[PDB]
Amino acid sequence: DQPFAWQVASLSERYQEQFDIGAAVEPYQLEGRQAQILKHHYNSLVAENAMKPESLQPREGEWNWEGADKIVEFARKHNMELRFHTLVWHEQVPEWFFIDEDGNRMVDETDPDKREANKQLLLERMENHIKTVVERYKDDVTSWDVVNEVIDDGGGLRESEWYQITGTDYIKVAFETARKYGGEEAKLYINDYNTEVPSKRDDLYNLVKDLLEQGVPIDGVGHQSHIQIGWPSIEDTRASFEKFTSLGLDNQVTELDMSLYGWPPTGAYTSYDDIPAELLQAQADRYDQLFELYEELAADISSVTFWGIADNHTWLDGRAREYNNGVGIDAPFVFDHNYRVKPAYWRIIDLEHHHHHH
């Protein structure tokens, strides 16, 4: 049987002078074996859920800091950089933001003058959310996901409530507000998934380039990297990183996981013991090529964060159940559900450098 994660060489050490290695965490994972693995292998953290808008301010003026603070305290004690997920997002956002002072839904307003009043009220609420969070955590966060998933998969901007009420101004104001209270030293990111898809990559590039030309402070791009064993291509990943580097932007890989399945994750395995060894080998081959690319582009990438620690906790389990009538698991990491190393661990810890020509 493979050794446990706490018995093998550190991932973060292996990528010194290349990029930090991070994990998404819940506060209840900051003890026992999961905390031991974090300290041994990772030098950067992000809150999986405790810092989302609905977690921090579920009602106006009701602040829920405890879980977020525990993650900050862990990052302080163990010398881990900390990313912030996330200041502004169309998911996991409390409904009160988009309700006017009469209890009406701003998105349904038809009077042009009340629409403008709603836009200013919503922006003030967004500004106050950002101000309060950034003032609390400024000296503990080194990468802010200021806005998340603002590009539509079908082209153009996502027509969320934020966009419906404020246009693109919520994006401009969010970055300006984060800069104002974070100071010039704060590093401000726009985060998204499928950034490797050329059409979406290009929409994100055009948005950021236009905003930079207006003086909006944007320092980098977060690539969620919710990927598969056979998709997206290394070539498309490379092109995406380089396109944002061409604007003077940092790149971070922010939510890396490699599903066993395609999309949708139909036909998922219902137990880890049913996963064929050849599939874990294919995952290992792909992770090898992926981290070889990251090494190639290490000047362009400051950190690579996995959206979890080991296979026993991943949002991909819930996704598998969604498309398989409530049953199914996924195994996206280099540490398996019992914290034992997987073939992918060996393939991204090693110093292999013989290339894979065909």
Name the active-site residue from 48, 81, 109, 149: 149
306, 22 contact by CB (below 8 A): yes
Residue 151 β-bridge partners: 157
> Which among 6-14, 31-39, 126-134, 311-319 is the span making contact with Ca ion, rule CB under 5 A?
311-319
Coil, helix or strand at residue 258 = strand
Residue 250 as a binder of Ni ion (CB under 5 A): the answer is no
Q: Cβ atoms within 10 A of the Cβ of 303, count?
A: 24
The piece of 13-21, 62-70, 188-196, 205-213 that touches Ca ion (CB under 5 A) is 13-21
In the bound state with Ca ion, the residue whose beta carbon lies nearer, of 197 and 298, is 298
The Cα–Cα gap between 288 and 292 comes to: 6
Q: Which residues contact 62 (CB under 8 A, 6 or more apart)?
A: none
Q: List, as one string, the DSSP characters of 94-151.
A: -GGGGB-TTS-BGGG---HHHHHHHHHHHHHHHHHHHHHHHHHHTTT-SEEEEEES-B
Question: Taking CB under 5 A as the rule, does residue 300 contact Ni ion?
Answer: no
- Least distance between Ca ion and beta carbon 317 (Å): 4
Quick check: helix, strand or coil at residue 318? helix
Q: Is 257 in the site for Ca ion (CB under 5 A)?
A: no
Residue 255 is a catalytic residue: yes
Q: Nearest Cα to 250, choosing from 45, 19, 46?
A: 19
Radius of gyration of the chain (CA): 21
Q: How far is the CB of 43 from Ni ion (least distance, A)?
A: 6
Q: How many residues bind to Ca ion according to rule CB under 5 A? A: 11
Q: How far is the CB of 12 from Ni ion (least distance, A)?
A: 9
Per CB under 5 A, contacts with Ni ion among 17-36 are 20
CB of 273 to Ca ion, least distance (A): 6
19 contributes a contact to Ca ion by CB under 5 A? yes
Collapse the DSSP code of 84 into the 3-class scheme (helix H, G, I; strand E, B; otherwise coil) and give the result. strand
User: Taking the complex as a whole, how short is the minimal distance between the CB of residue 343 and Ni ion, in angstroms?
Assistant: 13
State yes or no: residue 288 binds Ni ion (CB under 5 A).
yes
Residue 329 interacts with which of Ni ion, Ca ion, none, CB < 5 to 8 Å by class: Ca ion
State the catalytic residues: 149, 255
Binding residues for Ni ion (CB under 5 A): 20, 81, 288, 352
Binding residues for Ca ion (CB under 5 A): 19, 274, 288, 298, 311, 314, 317, 329, 347, 350, 352
